[PDB]
Amino acid sequence: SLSPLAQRVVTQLSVMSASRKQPKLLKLAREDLIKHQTIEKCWSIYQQQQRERRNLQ
Amino acid sequence: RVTPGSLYKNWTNTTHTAQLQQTAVPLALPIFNFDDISKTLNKVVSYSNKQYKSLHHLGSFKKSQFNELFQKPVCLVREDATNSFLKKLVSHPVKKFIITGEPGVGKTVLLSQAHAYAVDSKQIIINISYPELFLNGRNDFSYDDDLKLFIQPMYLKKLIRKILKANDPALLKSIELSKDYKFSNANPKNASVKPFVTLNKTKNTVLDLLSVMTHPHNRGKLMKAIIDELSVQSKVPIMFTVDNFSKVLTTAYSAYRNTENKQIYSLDLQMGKLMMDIISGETKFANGESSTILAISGVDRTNKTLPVALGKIPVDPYVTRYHYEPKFVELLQKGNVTEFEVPKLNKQEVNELIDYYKQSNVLLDKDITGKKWENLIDEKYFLSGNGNPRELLKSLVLSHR
Amino acid sequence: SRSVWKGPNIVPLPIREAMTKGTPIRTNARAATILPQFVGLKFQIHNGKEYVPIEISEDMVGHKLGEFAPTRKRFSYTQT
Amino acid sequence: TRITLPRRPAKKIQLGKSRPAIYHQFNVKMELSDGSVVIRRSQYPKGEIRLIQDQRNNPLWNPSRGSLDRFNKRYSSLFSTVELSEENKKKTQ
Amino acid sequence: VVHILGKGFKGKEVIKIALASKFYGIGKTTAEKICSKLGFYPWMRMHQLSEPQIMSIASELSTMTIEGDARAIVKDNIALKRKIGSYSGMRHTLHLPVRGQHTRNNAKTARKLNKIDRRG
RNA sequence: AAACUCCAUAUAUAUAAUUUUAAUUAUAUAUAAUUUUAUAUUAUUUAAUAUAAAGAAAGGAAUUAAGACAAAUCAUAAUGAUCCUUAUAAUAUGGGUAAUAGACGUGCUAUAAUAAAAUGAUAAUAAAAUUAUAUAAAAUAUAUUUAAUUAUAUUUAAUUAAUAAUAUAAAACAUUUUAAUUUUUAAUAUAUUUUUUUAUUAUAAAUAUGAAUUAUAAUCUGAAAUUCGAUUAUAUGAAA
RNA sequence: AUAUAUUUUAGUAAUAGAUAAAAAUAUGUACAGUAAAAUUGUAAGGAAAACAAUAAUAACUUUCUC
Ligand SMILES: Nc1nc2c(ncn2[C@@H]2O[C@H](COP(=O)(O)OP(=O)(O)O)[C@@H](O)[C@H]2O)c(=O)[nH]1
Ligand SMILES: [Mg+2]
Ligand SMILES: [Mg+2]
Ligand SMILES: [Mg+2]
Ligand SMILES: [Mg+2]
Ligand SMILES: [Mg+2]
Ligand SMILES: [Mg+2]
Ligand SMILES: [Mg+2]
Ligand SMILES: [Mg+2]
Ligand SMILES: [Mg+2]
Ligand SMILES: [Mg+2]
Ligand SMILES: [Mg+2]
Ligand SMILES: [Mg+2]
Ligand SMILES: [Mg+2]
Ligand SMILES: [Mg+2]
Ligand SMILES: [Mg+2]
Ligand SMILES: [Mg+2]
Ligand SMILES: [Mg+2]
Ligand SMILES: [Mg+2]
């Protein structure tokens, strides 16, 4: 069917592939989703501020 | 591609182990008894039935001999060789011999006669034919902790069995024990029920002690106990014998290796040490008439040790451990070993042997028919090297030249 | 000198000048043992015919110089 | 002639359902030539590595600042610089 | 029957000799040393070994540098030889005899198995 | 051609203060045989066979003619002719003569039990020959817990030799072991085959043959061992 | 730590992006995008394999900020 070299190539391919290695989707509650949004938005704002500070300097 | 009946072994083995003694003439010969040696002083003599039974168990009759030639193994009594030795054994205060001589002269045969005598005179016999088995490394062994030496619990078991069977039980069970003895049980029966076997002082017997069956690690302990018991008892004589003692003398270090890869010393073993102790004035038997009879074999190596031990050569200190072990010599000197040289056959003895062989029908046709008898005897004597019995026998039977 | 005692084989060379300034050492020795004192020096070892350029790595330290200048040409057969 | 792995029918990733390849990675500590440790994410399972030949001991990256081993071992009694000076006559070349 | 460290063994095969025959890293002396360490009588047979004894032998083998690891060392050495522009390495590459031999005639064994990947 | 010759043989004589001893020898000189005699049985006085009595009496080496093969050699050496004379003459450093597809001779080692391996110190039994460009004994040390063996190192005792050393000859013969071989082992009993027997249980085409090939470590010679030498050890264990 | 039973995993295989000029379904429809050449480079790579880069932001919307 397959050689040892062929097997090892398949294994190598698998290492890179998403076949049966990836978890379930990250589902959130609505409150949790909001909390996440507020975390991300604030962070983004902070990053923008920092960029402006550096740019201004 | 082999059947039960067919001979698969090599020659010497075949002659020992395939019963070609079957097809042989029955011979009504006289019986070996020391009390009636005057009757049969220079004649061929078959052993008694009891003696035979004992002797076979001990391991007196050996493979390279021509015991296949007759119905059963046979010897003749000799005034110069065997009778004199017996007298010495009877008379001497020490009673401690080493049977020396040239290869094939009849040391074993002398040992067998001594055993037979002991059997007749109500004595226990601890025979160690072929120490090569315990000395060379071809069976299991283990370092005992209580006894500071290496035990060998396959050989030991066999030796115990031989002791049990060679000797009659009435003589052996006349001995009460000095101490009590605990042993590990190793029966198929009563394994879970009886974890230990106990022998009491007065109630139990030496026979019972011998019949004990333990695990390998207690076998050496059992052996030690038995020896001690035999040393203590004064009711029966104990004949210790070791044939091919030459091997023991020469093979100072065994083939066994301890935890670190180096050879174990003979005196660091159980059996060899025990044997040495018996030889020397150390494990002294309580009874008189209790002898040690050692025997050299021409098979084995020769070196300076045994001559130095005896009154032969002055002690050269520079010769190597391989060719001269001084400890063994010292041990031999400690237990006063008086050596016994086996003399070669006289003309008359040779003639008598030849006559016996003729009666049994071993002689060839060219020897018997068309030949003077005296001349034939003289030729036989010449070819043996003036009465080496084995050589003579070989010339008679195994020549075909 | 092969035997560990008495070794190792030493020959006179223009070593120090090579060390100071990268001038290759044209050896016609071929039986001088390589040493730790010349790793990373350019040698031009004789081949019988033509001197062979070699840069001595740390793997060469035990060996002779002539071991890295192969004298005979690689054998072939003219299939006629 | 051409060595290949022959393809099976491809699995249909639906539009929107495609997920990004987040490979399994460990936080790995690299101690460089000197004792400066640096954390890097790595796919091979080894929490700690210490490096021998780095930029922090290479002369190009800081200008201002086992055959050989075997040889050293078995020519140790002689102790083999002074030896160089002794065995370096630069006349013959 | 009596398996030990993967290698199969017929019964009645004297232990040290059997070990020498099978395992790549060990010869006569090494096998004897192992036996001494474990405490088997010389000329003990493979069938006589109990399970704990077998386990102890296996452990001893694992402690020793043997079998595949030993083979790999030899391979590594020849790879090293090849790496430097060495004569020996060149001989190994070309499947000729390495040890200063003649090859006008009789160099067949060398041709057969003087590879960089030696053992098999 | 044979014979005389040499070696070897048998005998005699001489010599050797029988510590240079081996007199069971060595070496000079002889003698001895290409053996002799007789009875018979076949073929024609003889010649082969047989028998007998007398003897130690039986080999090997050197010598290989004339001619021939335009056999081999100008690379042992020499010489004719011819060619080279800053080169075809002379010296040094390295390399080569040891290259490897196939092929061909000679050998060596093998493919195991009418045959291989361990061992054998009152050291089983030889001959011939070498040792001032040397032979190297005993003994110590390491490989190696005993020691022996084998191999090196350490250091030279003896003798330049019938005196000492190379050198305890080896097969032989003897005990032990030996896979293929459940033709054995080991647990039990068993017994007048006990270094063994029987019973019942478990023991399931290159080895415990061979030594090519290779890896590493040491040693030896030499100033130097890479191409390109010889040992020893630990592994490797083709083919057959 | 280990034994048995009952399960669960390991068949290890590529696209992860509405993919966009390597090759492959050549007719429908829906959504989206832009090619090529030449030039400058870069491990084997060389005139010729692959990958990268190579026109202009006025005005507008949102975000942060002086
Ligand atoms: N004394 C004696 N010996 C005999 C007699 N019959 C046979 N023998 C031989 O005695 C020999 C035993 O001699 P032994 O000393 O054991 O030989 P070793 O084993 O080489 O020492 C055997 O080989 C027998 O052939 C006999 O009647 N008397
Ligand atoms: Mg005997
Ligand atoms: Mg092996
Ligand atoms: Mg004399
Ligand atoms: Mg002539
Ligand atoms: Mg002629
Ligand atoms: Mg001619
Ligand atoms: Mg000619
Ligand atoms: Mg000429
Ligand atoms: Mg010429
Ligand atoms: Mg000339
Ligand atoms: Mg010239
Ligand atoms: Mg030649
Ligand atoms: Mg053989
Ligand atoms: Mg000898
Ligand atoms: Mg010596
Ligand atoms: Mg001499
Ligand atoms: Mg072999
Ligand atoms: Mg084959």
Listing DSSP states for D48-77 in one string gives EEE-SS-GGG-TTT-S---HHHHHHHHTTT
Nearest to B181 by CA among B163, B203, B165: B203
How near does any CA of chain C get to the CA of D71, in Å? 6
**Euclidean distance between CA atoms E18 and C16, whole angstroms:** 58
Contact A18 D5 (CB under 8 A): no
Q: Are B40 and B30 in contact (CB under 8 A)?
A: yes
Edge to edge, the sheet with strand D37-42 lists: D37-42, D26-31, D48-50
Phi, psi of E18 (to 5 degrees): -60, -50
Nearest to B223 by CA among B236, B209, B237, B233: B209
Nearest to C43 by CA among C62, C20, C68, C63: C68
Any atom of ligand 1 within 6 Å of the Cβ of B75 = yes
Q: Return the structure tokens found at B274.
A: 């025990």
Contact E41 B141 (CB under 8 A): yes
Residues in CB range of C7: below 8 A, 6 or more apart: C1, C33, D75, D78
Torsion of CA B108, B112, B115, B117, to 10 degrees: -130
Q: What Å resolution does this PDB entry report?
A: 3.2
Place of tokens 């069977």: B165
> Is the Cβ of B258 closer than 8 Å to some Cβ of chain E?
yes
Place of tokens 């698998």: A14
Place of tokens 């200048």: C69
Any atom of ligand 1 within 6 Å of the Cβ of B104 = yes
- Provide the CA E23 to C1' F71 distance, Å, integer: 64
Residues in CB range of D91: below 8 A, 6 or more apart: C14
Q: Are C23 and C7 in contact (CB under 8 A)?
A: no
**Euclidean distance between CA atoms B116 and B55, whole angstroms:** 7
Kindly give the distance from the C-alpha atom of residue E94 to the centroid of ligand 13, in angstroms, as a whole number. 24
How far separated are the first and last CA of chain B, in Å rounded?
A: 34
Length of chain E in terms of residues written: 120
Q: Return the structure tokens found at D50.
A: 């210490």
**Euclidean distance between CA atoms A25 and B294, whole angstroms:** 93
Residues 130-189 of B with CB under 8 A from E: 137-142
In the three-class reduction of DSSP (H, G, I as helix; E, B as strand; rest coil), residue B400 is classed as coil
Contact C57 E84 (CB under 8 A): yes
Phi, psi of D74 (to 5 degrees): -95, 10
Interface test with D, best of A8, A19, A20, A21 (most D CBs within 10 A): A21
Q: Are B215 and B186 in contact (CB under 8 A)?
A: yes
Place of tokens 């290796």: B257
Phi, psi of E43 (to 5 degrees): 65, 25
Length of chain A in terms of residues written: 57
- Provide the CA B311 to C1' F123 distance, Å, integer: 21
Bridging pattern class, strands B181-184 and B196-199: antiparallel
Place of tokens 């509650």: A29
Q: Give the closest residue (by CA) to ligand 1 atom 2.
A: B106
Nearest to E34 by CA among B261, B140, B262: B261
**Euclidean distance between CA atoms B16 and B9, whole angstroms:** 10
In the three-class reduction of DSSP (H, G, I as helix; E, B as strand; rest coil), residue B57 is classed as helix
Q: Which long-range contacts (CB under 8 A, 24 or more apart) does C69-74 make?
A: C69/C30, C69/C45, C70/E85, C70/E87, C70/E90, C71/C47, C74/E94
> Residue B56: what residue type?
H
- Return the exposure string of B338-363: e unless at least 16 CB atoms fall within 10 Å of the residue's CB, then b: ebbebebbbeebbbbbbebbeebebb
Interface test with B, best of E41, E53, E64 (most B CBs within 10 A): E41
**Euclidean distance between CA atoms B122 and B109, whole angstroms:** 20
Q: For chain B, how big is the Rg over CA atoms in Å?
A: 23
Residues of A in contact with D19 (CB under 8 A): 18, 22, 25
Residue list, CB under 5 A from ion ligand 2: B 108, 297
Triad A40, A45, A48: Cα angle to 5°: 125
> Residue E58: what residue type?
A
Residues in CB range of B54: below 8 A, 6 or more apart: B115, B116, B119, B125, B166, B167, B168
Q: Which nucleotide is nearest to D16 (CA to C1')?
A: G18
Reduced 3-state DSSP string for B95-160:
CEEEEECCCCCCHHHHHHHHHHHHHHCCCEEEEEECCHHHHCCCCCCEECCCCCCEECCCHHHHHH
Phi, psi of D32 (to 5 degrees): -75, -165
**Euclidean distance between CA atoms E34 and B40, whole angstroms:** 60
Nearest to B173 by CA among B202, B203, B207, B223: B207
User: Which atom of ligand 1 lies closest to the CA of B110?
Assistant: 1
Check if residue A22 sits with its Cβ under 7 angstroms from strand G. yes
In the three-class reduction of DSSP (H, G, I as helix; E, B as strand; rest coil), residue B309 is classed as helix
Phi, psi of B68 (to 5 degrees): -65, -25
Q: How far is Cα of residue B362 from the mean position of the Cα atoms in its chain?
A: 27
> Residue D87: what residue type?
E
Q: Which long-range contacts (CB under 8 A, 24 or more apart) does D30-34 make?
A: D32/D56, D33/D57
Out of E32, E36, E43, the one facing B138 most closely (by C-beta) is E43
**Euclidean distance between CA atoms B232 and B290, whole angstroms:** 12
> Is the Cβ of B261 closer than 8 Å to some Cβ of chain E?
yes
Cis bond before residue B73 (omega within 30° of 0): no
**Euclidean distance between CA atoms C60 and B267, whole angstroms:** 56
In the three-class reduction of DSSP (H, G, I as helix; E, B as strand; rest coil), residue C12 is classed as coil
User: Which atom of ligand 1 lies closest to the CA of B74?
Assistant: 27
Residues of C in contact with D72 (CB under 8 A): 36
**Euclidean distance between CA atoms A17 and A13, whole angstroms:** 6
- Return the exposure string of E1-27: e unless at least 16 CB atoms fall within 10 Å of the residue's CB, then b: ebebbeeebeeebbbbebbbebbeebe
DSSP C4: T
Nearest to B170 by CA among B129, B119, B127: B119
Nearest to B363 by CA among B69, B76, B62, B15: B69
Q: Which subunits sit against C, judged by 3+ Cβ pairs under 8 A?
A: D, E
**Euclidean distance between CA atoms B381 and B79, whole angstroms:** 19
Q: Are C33 and C8 in contact (CB under 8 A)?
A: yes
DSSP C6: T
Q: Are B171 and B235 in contact (CB under 8 A)?
A: no
Place of tokens 């309580």: B286
Q: What is the DSSP string of A12-57?
A: HHHHHS-TTT--------HHHHHHHHHHHHHHHHHHHHHHHHHHH-
Out of D71, D78, D83, the one facing C61 most closely (by C-beta) is D71
Q: Return the structure tokens found at B189.
A: 């029966």
Residues of C in contact with D92 (CB under 8 A): 12, 14
Q: Are E24 and E70 in contact (CB under 8 A)?
A: yes
**Euclidean distance between CA atoms B32 and C26, whole angstroms:** 99
Phi, psi of E75 (to 5 degrees): -60, -45
Interface test with C, best of E80, E87, E104 (most C CBs within 10 A): E87
Q: Are C25 and C12 in contact (CB under 8 A)?
A: no
Q: Experimental method for this entry?
A: cryo-EM
Other CB atoms within a 10 A radius of the CB of residue C27 amount to: 22
Q: Return the structure tokens found at A38.
A: 């507020």
